[PDB]
Amino acid sequence: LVHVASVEKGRSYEDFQKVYNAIALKLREDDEYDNYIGYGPVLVRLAWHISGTWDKHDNTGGSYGGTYRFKKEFNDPSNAGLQNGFKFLEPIHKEFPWISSGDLFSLGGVTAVQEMQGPKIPWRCGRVDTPEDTTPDNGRLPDADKDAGYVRTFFQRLNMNDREVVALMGAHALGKTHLKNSGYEGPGGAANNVFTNEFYLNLLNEDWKLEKNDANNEQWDSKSGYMMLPTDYSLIQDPKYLSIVKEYANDQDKFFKDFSKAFEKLLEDGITFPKDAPSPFIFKTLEEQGL
Numbered sequence: 001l002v003h004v005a006s007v008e009k010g011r012s013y014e015d016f017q018k019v020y021n022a023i024a025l026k027l028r029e030d031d032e033y034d035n036y037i038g039y040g041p042v043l044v045r046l047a048w049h050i051s052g053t054w055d056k057h058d059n060t061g062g063s064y065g066g067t068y069r070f071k072k073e074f075n076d077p078s079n080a081g082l083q084n085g086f087k088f089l090e091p092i093h094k095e096f097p098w099i100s101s102g103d104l105f106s107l108g109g110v111t112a113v114q115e116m117q118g119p120k121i122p123w124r125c126g127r128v129d130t131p132e133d134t135t136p137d138n139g140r141l142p143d144a145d146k147d148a149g150y151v152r153t154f155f156q157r158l159n160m161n162d163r164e165v166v167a168l169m170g171a172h173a174l175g176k177t178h179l180k181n182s183g184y185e186g187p188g189g190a191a192n193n194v195f196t197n198e199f200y201l202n203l204l205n206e207d208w209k210l211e212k213n214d215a216n217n218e219q220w221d222s223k224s225g226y227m228m229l230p231t232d233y234s235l236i237q238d239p240k241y242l243s244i245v246k247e248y249a250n251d252q253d254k255f256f257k258d259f260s261k262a263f264e265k266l267l268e269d270g271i272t273f274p275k276d277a278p279s280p281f282i283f284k285t286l287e288e289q290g291l
């Protein structure tokens with residue numbers, strides 16, 4: 001399967017910076033969502049789940065085709081709760097009907113991270129919508145109730161290595177688990193709509209307790225009111241993972257730099273970019289624009 005990036009006709013940096021600003025302006029406006037967390041965390045989760053279907057072996061799945069717009073992927077049990085990120089973006093797609101679905105879902109994730117004061121993420125245009133029959137089947141996204149060997153093995157399919165996996169998981173400092181979506185409940189920290197390295201700090205400094213929640217699932221709970229998933233706590237159980245966790249709890253700039261590279265790579269897996277294709281765009285935030 002080859003998927004070649006095709007820039008939307010005649011579009012350039014300024015067009016996509018207009019779509020960025022539209023998403024970012026609505027993130028500021030619709031602030032009440034999920035008890036004032038706002039839409040940013042569900043939008044970086046949506047960009048991860050449309051990319052996380054990729055399989056390196058046959059180049060199926062991935063962010064290129066925008067296939068989450070089809071019922072099979074929209075109704076995947078693993079995507080429960082992401083309909084709220086879709087409905088947030090649907091106004092903006094009506095306003096810029098020329099951007100492809102893959103591009104709009106991935107730029108929403110980029111915009112949310114930078115607007116929640118994360119690192120800049122280089123983003124590239126050119127994903128092309130593909131037919132309903134290209135939609136990957138349910139079951140390619142990871143279970144939460146498993147251990148470190150499962151996480152390592154699952155992420156080899158998206159060929160991410162240990163460092164990349166640990167840098168990507170730092171995004172679980174954002175938002176929260178919702179019992180009616182996943183059977184898990186609670187936030188992982190106090191700053192859950194500002195991008196920081198707090199996931200790593202909480203993992204190493206809190207007093208975790210294995211408890212059973214109302215959906216009868218086990219999760220790691222702390223006195224402070226935070227929770228960690230079994231696959232999250234996995235990172236301090238494995239010796240290779242645990243020493244990268246310590247590296248990111250001791251250096252927030254290295255965390256930001258490595259997250260930026262692994263999230264771009266995540267979003268680009270499966271796509272062939274021609275050598276005459278434009279460079280990756282670095283978008284300015286509303287704040288850097290005085291907007």
Ligand code: HEM
Pocket residue numbers: 041042044045048080081142143144145151168169171172174175176177178179181182183184229231263
């Ligand atoms: C083995 C890996 C992973 C598993 C099992 C997993 C699982 C989960 C689960 C069960 C939730 C709760 C969903 C809900 O109830 O609403 C969640 C939320 C979230 N995850 Fe993951 N995740 C994984 C990796 C990642 C990665 C790599 C990213 C992003 C780079 C990510 C970003 C998020 C975000 C931002 C949320 C919060 C959503 C919200 O607030 O609504 N996840 N994760």
